[PDB]
Design a protein around this nucleic acid. Sequence first.
RNA 1: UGAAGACAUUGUCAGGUGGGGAGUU
Lengths: 88, 46, 153, 177
Amino acid sequence: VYSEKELGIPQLNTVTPVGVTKPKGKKKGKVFVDDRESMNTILAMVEAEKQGQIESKIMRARQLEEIREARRIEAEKKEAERKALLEN
Amino acid sequence: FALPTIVALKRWMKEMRKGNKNAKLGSSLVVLVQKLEMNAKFIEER
Amino acid sequence: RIQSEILKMVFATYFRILKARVPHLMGAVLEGLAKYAHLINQDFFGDLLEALKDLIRDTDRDTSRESLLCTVTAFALLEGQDAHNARSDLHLDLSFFITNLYRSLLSLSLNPDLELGNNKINLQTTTVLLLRCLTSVLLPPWNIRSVPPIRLA
Amino acid sequence: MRPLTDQEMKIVLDKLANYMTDLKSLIAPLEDGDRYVFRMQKDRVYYVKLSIANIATCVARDKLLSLGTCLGKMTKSGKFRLHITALPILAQNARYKIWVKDNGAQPFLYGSNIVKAHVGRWTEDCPEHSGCVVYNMADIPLGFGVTARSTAEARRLDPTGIVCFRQADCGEYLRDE
RNA sequence: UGAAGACAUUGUCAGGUGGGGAGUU
């Protein structure tokens, strides 16, 4: 039993996409999550993962809609930031 | 004592910023809640 | 089996009143809902606690009575013995109703229709609805010594 | 000094979610409009105000030592470990709470795990390996740790048995003097 | 043309920091 991080295993394209892959041994450019909206969406998945199984179907849906609304508000802020960057 | 009253008019400044067109009446209440906040502030040090 | 069919027709009438927003009827519905929720399925108990949340958000969009009616009904659901032992299993958190009760106390003092002349929910005056809500928050029958003092203060 | 990234903030908030409940209370705007943020300085996470962190930019990177309240450090392997300097944040919104007697508080401050005979009060419905915060009988926060067994399981315990593994106690302040 | 108002915002210098962005070895 050894870690996949230590072995030089290539990333494989699955239903979950690989995306753009950064080269090994070079600068993996840091993206910051200082924004409160970007802080809320990460917080929604942490609280959802720890809570686990809920018997209620409605409360199970509200646990997912909180994550969905957090993603939408963050995306609107990022698009407004992208528009402000395009103006500048 | 005053605190329920100022927070009531703070909503009222929000609706007129969004009713009538009484700018003179709206301005007079603005000074009134500026008064009540200040005497609330100025009494907290005594 | 007969209890299953009666509970279906009784609860369907209850939820159709809550959707239609009939004011005088929905005071009586919450009394029936608080009385008979422990008979219905376990999964639906958290749904009732979340449908009450949606009603309170709708009045937050007379209106003081509807919010306090749904608040005392949620506390009356967790009042019951079997529901109290299932707080850990059924994730029934009353933190929404405590916080919404706290944020409405300043607005409730301003509104002047607070006193208008053996049940638990269907009381007429708003003041005694507020009193029964604070009795549930501050003086609960269960765990009255393990109450957060900061919530008390 | 830099803010956390996406991977770092997931790890930090995962450790905080083990011990606390209202995590959105931490990321919440107060009356003045400012917020509490997270800053990283020399592999160490600082829970500080945004207004404080903005006017601490003028301190040089090598010449800055501390900022607000330090939560803990991120190790070489990437894990995030909580320190006792994060205890006032943990005690504010503690999920599970254990109270020890005067005969159990002093062993805890020396570095021992809580034994059954030391406990003065439990919290009902606590899972097996959960994050608990240790108090004395005077509601003074002493530290935090992980429970050994469930509350129902530990009520039947032999009173030399371990009920909570120690992770941090406030005798660490005596270490750095 | 209505509303706010000599306070913000903005502009120019002199600085501080810059694990972020762009260039050279």
